Amino acid sequence: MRNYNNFNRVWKAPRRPFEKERLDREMKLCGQYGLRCKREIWRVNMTLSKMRRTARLLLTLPENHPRRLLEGSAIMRRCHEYGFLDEEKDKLDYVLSLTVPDILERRLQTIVFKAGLAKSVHHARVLIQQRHIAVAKQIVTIPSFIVRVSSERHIAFADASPFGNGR
Amino acid sequence: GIVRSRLHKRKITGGKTKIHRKRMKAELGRLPANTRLGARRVSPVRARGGNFKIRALRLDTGNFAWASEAIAHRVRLLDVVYNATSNELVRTKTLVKNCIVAVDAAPFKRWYAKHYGIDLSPKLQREWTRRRRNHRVEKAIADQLREGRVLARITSRPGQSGRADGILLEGAELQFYLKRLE
Amino acid sequence: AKKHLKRLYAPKDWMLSKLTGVFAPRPRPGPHKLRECLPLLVIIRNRLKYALNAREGEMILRQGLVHVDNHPRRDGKYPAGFMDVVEIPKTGDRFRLMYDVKGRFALVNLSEAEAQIKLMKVVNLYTATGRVPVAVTHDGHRIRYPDPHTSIGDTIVYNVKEKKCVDLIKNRQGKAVIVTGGANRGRIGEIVKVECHPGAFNIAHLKDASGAEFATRAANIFVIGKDLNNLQVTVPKQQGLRMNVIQEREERLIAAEARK
Amino acid sequence: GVVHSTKMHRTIIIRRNYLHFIKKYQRYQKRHKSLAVHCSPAFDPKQGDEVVIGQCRPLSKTIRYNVLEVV
RNA sequence: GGAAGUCGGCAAAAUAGAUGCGUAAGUUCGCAAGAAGCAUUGGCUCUGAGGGCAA
RNA sequence: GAUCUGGUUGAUUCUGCCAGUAGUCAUAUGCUUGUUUCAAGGACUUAGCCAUGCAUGCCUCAGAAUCACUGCAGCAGGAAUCUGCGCAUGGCUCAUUAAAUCAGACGUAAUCUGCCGCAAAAAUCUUGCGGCCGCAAAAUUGGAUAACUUGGCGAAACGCCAAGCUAAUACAUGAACCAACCGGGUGUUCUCCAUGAGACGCCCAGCGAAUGAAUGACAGUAAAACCAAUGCCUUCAGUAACACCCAGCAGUGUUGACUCAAUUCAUUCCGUGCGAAAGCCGGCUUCCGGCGUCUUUUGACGAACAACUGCCCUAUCAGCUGGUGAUGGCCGUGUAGUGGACUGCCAUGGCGUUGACGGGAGCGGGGGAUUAGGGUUCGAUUCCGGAGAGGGAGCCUGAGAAAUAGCUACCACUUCUACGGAGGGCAGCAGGCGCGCAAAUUGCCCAAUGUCAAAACAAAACGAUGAGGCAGCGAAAAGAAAUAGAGUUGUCUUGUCAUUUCAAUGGGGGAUAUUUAAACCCAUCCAAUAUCGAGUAACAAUUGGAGGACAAGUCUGGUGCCAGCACCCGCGGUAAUUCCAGCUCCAAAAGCGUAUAUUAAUGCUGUUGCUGUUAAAGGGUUCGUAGUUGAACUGUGGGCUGUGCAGGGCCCUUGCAGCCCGUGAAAAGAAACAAGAAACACGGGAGUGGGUCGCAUGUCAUGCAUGCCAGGGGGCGUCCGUGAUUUUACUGUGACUAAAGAAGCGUGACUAAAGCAGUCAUUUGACUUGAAUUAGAAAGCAUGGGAUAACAAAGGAGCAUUUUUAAAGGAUUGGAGAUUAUGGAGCUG
RNA sequence: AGUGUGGAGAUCGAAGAUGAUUAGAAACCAUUGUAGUCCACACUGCAAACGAUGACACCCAUGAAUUGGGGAU
Ligand SMILES: [K+]
Ligand SMILES: [K+]
Ligand SMILES: [Mg+2]
Ligand SMILES: [Mg+2]
Ligand SMILES: [Mg+2]
Ligand SMILES: [Mg+2]
Ligand SMILES: [Mg+2]
Ligand SMILES: [Mg+2]
Ligand SMILES: [Mg+2]
Ligand SMILES: [Mg+2]
Ligand SMILES: [Mg+2]
Ligand SMILES: [Mg+2]
Ligand SMILES: [Mg+2]
Ligand SMILES: [Mg+2]
Ligand SMILES: [Mg+2]
Ligand SMILES: [Mg+2]
Ligand SMILES: [Mg+2]
Ligand SMILES: [Mg+2]
Ligand SMILES: [Mg+2]
Ligand SMILES: [Mg+2]
Ligand SMILES: [Mg+2]
Ligand SMILES: [Mg+2]
Ligand SMILES: [Mg+2]
Ligand SMILES: [Mg+2]
Ligand SMILES: [Mg+2]
Ligand SMILES: [Mg+2]
Ligand SMILES: [Mg+2]
Ligand SMILES: [Mg+2]
Ligand SMILES: [Mg+2]
Ligand SMILES: [Mg+2]
Ligand SMILES: [Mg+2]
Ligand SMILES: [Mg+2]
Ligand SMILES: [Mg+2]
Ligand SMILES: [Mg+2]
Ligand SMILES: [Mg+2]
Ligand SMILES: [Mg+2]
Ligand SMILES: [Mg+2]
Ligand SMILES: [Mg+2]
Ligand SMILES: [Mg+2]
Ligand SMILES: [Mg+2]
Ligand SMILES: [Mg+2]
Ligand SMILES: [Mg+2]
Ligand SMILES: [Mg+2]
Ligand SMILES: [Mg+2]
Ligand SMILES: [Mg+2]
Ligand code: NA
Ligand code: NA
Ligand code: NA
Ligand code: NA
Ligand code: NA
């Protein structure tokens, strides 16, 4: 009653519940990135769909439309900041080519694994959940934390963790 | 109670309005004064905003203007002789705006004498000569003044203001009402 | 009559959060319209932060510490809109209520002998009993003997301490105006032409410093000086110059990067 | 508006014909409104004449406009 | 009280003029119809409407 | 992500539905459930019925205290009661409702408006003292009534009498001089002139209201006479007016437009308006502050009314309205005000197949769901608008109510009683009973947000608030996220396996504490000298399935067309891939089934975008009225230079300057061109009549005033008068358009759903921090464009030269108004 | 086809009659026969009222024909 705090969904189910190729591809993504359920892949799917829909809407406009100049710049900035796109490519058309592993690569679980602090993505998951990982000295316990390119050099074991400077 | 709203009226299509609210105080009407001629009796009506309307039930004196001489006088009303709405109101002696009444004429005669020295100090005689130079009383007026009753038209609303004021009938309007009264 | 004001229904420029409470202080009748005002409680609590909540705001205001146009105002629901001078002598801060280029309320700091003057736009002229001409201003002031050249739409520069007229700024081509309503509120420009549409809203065609052209209804322009160079009032930082959105975003990004 | 009837004393009926757009079908509809207008004896409009009218205070149950000019 | 009387409402009671409003099934479309029903009419004192002859 | 698959045949290709599939802040129900964040929550059925309790009161320096009240030694608190304000807001619900309500956009010049802002105010014969007069002056006004006391009545009653006291800022009354300016009417009153002029006497002359009469401007003709009065020079040029004491104390309100603002004159309020509250409190007898209140006024907050475009289905609803108001007129009445709102009288109107009238379902929007697009659908419910308080209708008070935790009555129900009587209104909060498929605690609190109010906070001294907030219950829905990580030996490069080793961590238990109004949650920690805990990590994950659609067994037992399954196709009749079970496997997973709706799937409602020979579907044939739709045509602009894979001196691009930009006809004028043009004319037109330290006028004058580019011709601004006429639609711009919600910028609230915050500095502060931007039908407003169109008119024989001069005829200066005539400009021949 | 009023009434022929066939045969077949069938006037308004194909307008390949009107030899 008279409460105006917003909320929304972040994922959607596939239209076809049993496609063998989709099911196999998702099980592969789960095994290789160490996910708990298909909802994580579907969350990435919704994020990618929203970004791609924005890019299509922007590309339909003439190149010097002020909305294109503003929002294309913003979306390129975000993609470069989070490492979804390589900093070399800077056109609006490269967002359309983004794939699910491109976003999954920037998860804190995958990043911790690729940085050598963990023996596997499964080790990385439990390492993050147990407060042993800090990003710029801030303990991050969320494996789905999307790491900016600027924060990649500040990922170390937490000071309070027994693997850092803690008891 | 009495309402002034349009809800009870038929639509122009002839269909019936389906009312879905009770009647409001802000659209009320009140019972008419039906002011009659007689010794003064007025009843205040508290109106919207806290202001007071004066509802006159009986009146017998009015402030009546002689427009051509640009003056006015407080005079006794003698009879109401014509009403355009219905001659039932002439019969009931009802005072409403634009009804024709007969007012006492003697004050207008006395003012006529004081202002012109005519009955139908040297400096005042100088003034009397200064006037009358382009002045000619009407025959239709002066004839009425001699018999002591002038026809006048009520200009106020006795149901609203509590006053039966008016103006003396002159000219084509006086001829119009004189024709209708014979 | 409505005594309450829902927070969602309150004007957006008051910067009241939708989650902080159900209600907002309903402005009382007074000098300014409630859709075009900034209540004293809002000023003292949300804008100046001298009070942390409404109770402290009442403690501050009921003591008469806050002066509007040289008079102490003890009501947190006092309207206190455009061009008003607010003074709190105990802390020494003094300012004029203005519109910034984004159209929000701005508290432009004033010096003494600048706070003794306020500009008032004439909205009506009528004759009072005794054949006394009276000018009604946008602030609800009724000035009893204005300059005989005063017209509806002109500006009266007014000494609030002495309660006296000082000068008159007529509404003519080439004059400096500020927009007080609509999409262009807060922009400073020059009157280039005012087309008259009798029985309709007259449209004033304006031109800012950078040569950007814009228009608005004649009711929304406020003469503030003879030229954009010499204004009779101090104006907020941006000087009424609307900035490109792309340019604004880029400059903000670069400045933030420089800060880090 | 166009004058539609002159049967009343000092009052005329006018028609305002216009096209109403239906968004779904991207097409227009012919529609008309009818307004009772007070006509001063200063004008003598006939059926089919064009008139300029101006809004005034209520003059009767339906009349809200006055004939201002007859084309 | 109200058909319990009587073979049977027989007898009696009842309804009532004029005017306005209103009037079902059915129907050979003519009616049914005065269907059924509702209301009003006194006395006084006035007001309005409805004409003819002549210059 | 602009997507389909199973079922009709022996097989095939169709049509077509059925079934499948995904979503729903979309409800219910079943099974299941460790952690945390964010949230809906008796709308659907019964606008059904309700026990109990609480929901609206307010006092400080500043209205009234002799409590027989308290503390102190008169001061200070101060129960009660009177007085002033509020209780018309908020909260709840969605029953009614289709020229109603509502959205956007307009009006009120048709009106009312307490509280709030800024202002205004010179009416008024009062009081005390001697005998109506005299004197005098800081006005020392009068009767009541509460609380209280006494007697009490009554079963009771948010029921009552009667006598005593006594206050107010309650109520009533009432203030001369000080004290102005201005005007009108008048004396058989005096001077003074020849009918003027001046004094003096008295009758009035305030705000607001009523009637009447005037003002509330002018703005397309330039000049000289005469009579009368009056101004001037002297004994007719200049000149606002004004017959002195103010020689400029309004000759000038506003609008788009006013019978409005305001002013003058006359008459009237007054029997229902107008105090300096005859008020209160502070500083220093003296002044100077802060409040409080009457009347007038206008702008703010509102109220009420009107309606430009839009708004479901139904013709097995075709006519609707007009005794007795239907549509319009006239004079009234009533209202705050307009109005058939209403009386009387007149006239026949008004509406309708572009769907009236009637019937049905619905409160309307902001918005939600779904969506390539176009669409379909939902919207009781947080914001805005409307409406109601069991049903109906009346009403008082009040600025505002047709009020309901106000009154009055009736109808239903219904409570107490001593039987005399007296009461009630949860669609407020909580909670019952019923109804149902269907929806929480008779909890804590005013800390936050606000409202009211005589009110800052605090000091003997804490305003009320079920509005609101907080917690409880709560798998509606939404976000994040456990149920393990690394190994060793062998077994069988991996990978399963029996082990047998390490660490790690929450769930949980606690706390120096933190949070919170207090609690509870979240965070922080398991020493800082000094702080618990996993190995079947038993701290043990489920719900549906495994023939096809559709991911996953041709396993093993049981049953034997039974039991059962199966949304559809089908399975089961003794070797069941389908039932009942075990095992194993599959899908989603702290969730997962089922039912009913609804969106997509659906080009199976088709504008985009369907079908009609035989699958459903062209009327038997014509005629025909609204309706829809409807053929061409008024129209290639030209020269000059340079530049281009131009192409077979020309045309064609690109680009700069020329055109009277078809012919004609020339600094001016003529032809087209103009209404946004042209011809006139207005200082009351324009920041003085626009762009082009001395002199002069007069000087009884804040004349302390005014001029110091003349003049011509042009260009302009404002306002008025007279003259040809062009719209709509579309399209481009611009303006006007609540938040919440949708997009979107920025920002590591640990992430995210969110939110509009926060960030940075060796530290009393920067960032003169941020809180960008959009879209949001249709109608409405201004304006550019003229190709496609529409509306209107016409129907081509009612279709008709520019000037010059001349003769003939029939408003302005002049000293200003007046009067009175010449003299013209301006009309036909 | 059917209806009403007048007329007509040769043929054929719903109803009906009789004879066959047949398990039965209310049928098919045979012989008959009423109403009808035909006309005037007035109704009815239905057909596989069919091209199961609405009306108007434009473009559209080839050969032999056919009905009416024109033109040339
Ligand atoms: K209420
Ligand atoms: K709660
Ligand atoms: Mg019997
Ligand atoms: Mg018997
Ligand atoms: Mg009998
Ligand atoms: Mg019948
Ligand atoms: Mg009968
Ligand atoms: Mg009868
Ligand atoms: Mg088959
Ligand atoms: Mg077969
Ligand atoms: Mg509810
Ligand atoms: Mg209910
Ligand atoms: Mg006190
Ligand atoms: Mg309310
Ligand atoms: Mg509720
Ligand atoms: Mg006024
Ligand atoms: Mg009417
Ligand atoms: Mg309903
Ligand atoms: Mg709703
Ligand atoms: Mg509401
Ligand atoms: Mg109500
Ligand atoms: Mg109820
Ligand atoms: Mg009530
Ligand atoms: Mg209640
Ligand atoms: Mg008793
Ligand atoms: Mg009741
Ligand atoms: Mg309740
Ligand atoms: Mg309810
Ligand atoms: Mg409740
Ligand atoms: Mg439930
Ligand atoms: Mg509540
Ligand atoms: Mg078996
Ligand atoms: Mg078996
Ligand atoms: Mg089988
Ligand atoms: Mg089809
Ligand atoms: Mg067909
Ligand atoms: Mg077919
Ligand atoms: Mg067929
Ligand atoms: Mg037919
Ligand atoms: Mg035809
Ligand atoms: Mg036949
Ligand atoms: Mg025959
Ligand atoms: Mg035969
Ligand atoms: Mg056979
Ligand atoms: Mg035979
Ligand atoms: Na006074
Ligand atoms: Na009237
Ligand atoms: Na099985
Ligand atoms: Na089963
Ligand atoms: Na056929």
Q: Where are the beta strands (DSSP E) in B83-123?
A: 100-104
Count of CB contacts below 8 A, A vs C? Answer: 14
Answer yes or no: is B87 CB < 7 A from strand E: yes
Under 8 Å CB pairs connecting chains B and D tally to 4
As a whole number of angstroms, the distance between CA A156 and CA B47 comes to: 83
Who contacts D8 (Cβ-Cβ below 8 Å, separation ≥6)? D36
Environment class of C43 (CB within 10 Å of its CB; exposed 0-12, middle 13-18, buried 19+): buried
C-alpha distance from residue C225 to each of B34, B129, C235 (Å) = 63, 64, 11
User: What is the rounded CA–CA span in Å between residue A40 and residue A108?
Assistant: 13
Tokens coding A155: 């990922």
Q: Which of B19, B35, B112, B40 is nearest to B71 (CA)?
A: B112
Instruction: Check if the beta carbon of residue D16 is closer than 8 Å to that of residue D32.
Output: yes
Closest CA to C68 of C105, C43, C36: C43
* Amino acid type, C194: V
Report the 10 Å Cβ neighbour count for C187: 25
Q: Could you tell me the CA-to-CA distances from C256 to C132, C247, C250, C253, D18 in Å, in that order? A: 59, 14, 10, 5, 57
Instruction: Check if the beta carbon of residue C165 is closer than 8 Å to that of residue C179.
Output: no
Q: Give yes or no for a contact between D66 and D38, defined as CB atoms under 8 angstroms apart.
A: yes
Interface of B with D in 11-40 (CB under 8 A): 12
Beta strands in C138-175 (DSSP E): 142-143, 155-159, 164-169
| Collapsed DSSP state (helix, strand, coil) of residue D40 | coil
Q: Is B93 helix (H, G, I), strand (E, B) or coil?
A: coil
Q: How far is CA B61 from CA B35, B145, B164, in A?
A: 13, 18, 7
**A23 CA, F563 C1': Å apart:** 38
The two beta strands, B36-37 and B52-59, are: parallel
Strand F, nucleotides < 7 Å from a protein CB: these are 1, 3, 21-25, 38-41, 88-92, 95-100, 106-107, 109-110, 112-120, 186-189, 195-196, 207-213, 250, 253-257, 261-263, 265-273, 291, 296-310, 319-322, 325-345, 347-352, 354, 356-358, 374-376, 382-389, 392-395, 397-403, 447-452, 455-457, 467-469, 477-487, 503-506, 524-528, 550-552, 586-590, 607, 627-628, 687, 719, 729-730, 734-748, 750-757, 759-760, 767-769, 771-774, 777-779, 781-783, 792-793
Structure tokens at B126: 């100088």
Nearest by CB to residue A70, choosing from C8, C22, C245, is C245
Give the neighbours of chain B: at least 3 Cβ pairs within 8 Å: D
Contact present, B168 and B151 (Cβ < 8 Å):
yes
Distance CA C46, CA C15 (A): 8
- Taken in order C91, C97, C100, C103, is the CA torsion positive or negative? positive
CB B152: neighbour CB atoms within 10 A?
Answer: 26
Edge-to-edge order in the sheet of strand C105-109: C71-72, C67-68, C85-88, C93-99, C105-109
Residue of C30, C133, C131 whose CA lies nearest to C78: C30
CB spacing of B6 vs D62 below 8 angstroms: no
**Burial environment of residue C175 by CB neighbours within 10 A (0 to 12, 13 to 18, 19 or more):** buried
- Count CB-CB contacts under 10 A for residue A166: 12
Contacts of C11 (CB under 8 A, 6+ apart): C35
DSSP-derived 3-state class of residue B130: helix
Tell which of C16, C18, C23, C244 to mutate to test the A interface (max A CBs under 10 Å).
C18
Query: How far apart are the C-alpha atoms of C142 and C13, rounded to whole Å?
Result: 28
Tell me the C-alpha to C-alpha distance, in Å, between residue B27 and each of A42, B24, B41, B51, C256: 63, 6, 27, 16, 64
Q: Helix, strand, coil shares of chain D as percentages rounded to 5?
A: 0, 55, 45
Is residue C197 within 8 Å of residue C215, measured between CB atoms? no
Residues 6+ apart with CB under 8 A from B34: B57, B92, B94
- 3-class SS of residue C44: helix
Structure tokens at C5: 């004001």
Q: Flag whether residue D29 sits within 8 Å of chain B, measured between CB atoms.
A: no
Contacts of C13 (CB under 8 A, 6+ apart): C38, C103, C104, C105
Give the single-character DSSP code of B94: B
CB-based contact C246 A4, cutoff 8 Å: no
Q: Which nucleotide is nearest, taking the CA of residue B86 and each C1'?
A: F344
- Chain position carrying tokens 């306020």: C118
Residue C19 CA distance to nucleotide F25 C1' (Å) = 19
3-state secondary structure of C174: coil
Rounded Cα gap, residues B115 and B111, in angstroms: 6
Q: Is the CB of B17 under 7 A from strand E?
A: no
Buried/exposed C133-170: b ≥16 CB within 10 Å, e otherwise: eebbbbbebebeebbeebeebbbbbbebeeeebeebbe
Tell me the C-alpha to C-alpha distance, in Å, between residue C231 and each of C29, C165, C166. 31, 18, 15
CA distance C110 to C92: 11
Whole-number Å distance between alpha carbons of A138 and A154: 10
CA–centroid distance for B97 within its chain: 5
CA distances from C96 to C46, C106, D69 (A): 16, 8, 52
Which nt has its C1' nearest the CA of A2?
A: F382
Taking only Cα atoms into account, the Rg of chain C, rounded to an integer number of angstroms, comes to 19
Q: Three-class SS of residue B164?
A: coil
Q: Which amino acid is at D54?
A: G
Q: Which two tokens stand for residue A119?
A: 């023996």
**Strand, coil or helix: what is B115?**
helix
C-alpha of B69 from chain center: 18
From CA B48, how far away is CA D9, in angstroms rounded? 36
Run of H or E including B107: helix B106-116
**Cβ contact C191:C171 at 8 Å:** yes
SS3 at position B147? helix
Q: Are C180 and C13 in contact (CB under 8 A)?
A: no
The answer to whether C177 touches C188, Cβ cutoff 8 Å, is yes
Q: What is the 3-state secondary structure (H, E, C) of B7-68?
A: CCCCCCCCCCCCCCCCCCHHHECCCCCCCEECCCEEEEEECHHHCEEEEEEEECEEEEEEHH
Note whether D41 and D70 are within 8 A (CB).
Answer: no
- Named by the residue before each, gaps in chain D exceeding 2.5 A from C to N are none
Report helix, strand or coil for B102.
strand
Q: Which residues of B touch D61 (CB under 8 A)?
A: 6, 9, 12
Rounded CA-CA distance A71/A91 in Å is 12
**CA B111 – ligand 9 centroid, Å:** 122
Backbone angles phi, psi at C41, to 5 degrees: -60, -40
Instruction: Tell me, letter by letter, the H, E, C secondary structure of chain A.
Output: CCCCCCCCCCCCCCCCCCCHHHHHHHHHHHHHHCCCCHHHHHHHHHHHHHHHHHHHHHHCCCCCCHHHHHHHHHHHHHHHHHCCCCCCCCCHHHHHHCCHHHHHCCEHHHHHHHCCCCCCHHHHHHHHHCCCEEECCEECCCCCCECCCCCHHHEEECCCCCCCCCC
- Closest to B103 measured CA to CA, from B74, B71, B143: B74
Neighbouring CB atoms inside 10 A of B97's CB total 16
CA pair distance D12, D1, nearest whole angstrom: 11
Is the distance from CB of C176 to CB of C190 less than 8 angstroms? Answer: yes
Angle formed at CA A58 by CA A56 and CA A64, multiple of 5 degrees: 145
Q: What residues have CB less than 8 Å from C182, skipping those under 6 apart?
A: C216, C217, C220
Residue among B87, B166, C17 at smallest CA distance from C7: C17
List Cβ<8 Å contacts ≥24 apart for C168-172: C169/C119, C169/C223, C169/C224, C169/C225, C169/C226, C169/C232, C170/C223, C171/C221, C171/C223
Helix H or strand E encompassing B114: helix B106-116
Q: Which residues in window 204-243 of C are less than 7 A from strand F by Cβ?
A: 214-217, 220, 226, 237
Inter-residue contact B153 to B166 (CB < 8 Å)? yes
What's the token pair of residue D15?
């028609």
Burial (0-12, 13-18, 19+ Cβ within 10 Å), A131? middle
